[PDB]
Ligand SMILES: [Zn+2]
């Protein structure tokens with residue numbers, strides 16, 4: 305009975321290959337709003353009719369992330385509500401989100417960081433691993449193609465290469481294992 309101990313070996317690199325799905329989360333809806341005839345939007349009080357009358361408008365829906373209400377043409381409806389163009393930026397990245405949108409933890413986030421921060425990534429440099437790239441994952445967790453190496457040899461381990469997984473997440477060959485602790 306020759307059964308090797310808790311040992312492993314690098315194999316064919318592969319990834320989850322998903323990149324999330326726009327259909328999953330409710331993306332921003334670019335549509336023409338129907339607020340082109342409410343309150344005093346147009347500058348000055350004129351144009352057809354002459355002198356009109358429109359003061360405060362209570363019980364009116366306010367722009368998502370704003371103090372007043374919407375009254376423009378093109379509006380982005382997302383997160384079960386209408387979110388302005390400039391009022392739809394990532395609270396963290398603060399980058400222009402004029403294409404997609406995301407919500408989580410009572411805050412509007414983007415999909416970019418959702419994959420890295422709220423997804424899978426390298427367990428070495430905390431970098432965001434692509435969606436379907438090509439890399440080898442350590443048993444359960446995933447690692448980098450470059451970061452991958454030995455604690456002593458400091459050399460990457462390609463398919464076929466035998467490496468051990470330390471309790472503190474560390475790659476160690478056979479000879480390095482015993483020499484390391486065992
Ligand atoms: Zn706004």
Ligand SMILES: [Zn+2]
Nearest residue numbers: 394397414417
């Ligand atoms: Zn973001």
Ligand SMILES: [Zn+2]
Nearest residue numbers: 426428429448
């Ligand atoms: Zn890394």
Ligand SMILES: [Zn+2]
Nearest residue numbers: 454457477480
């Ligand atoms: Zn080694």
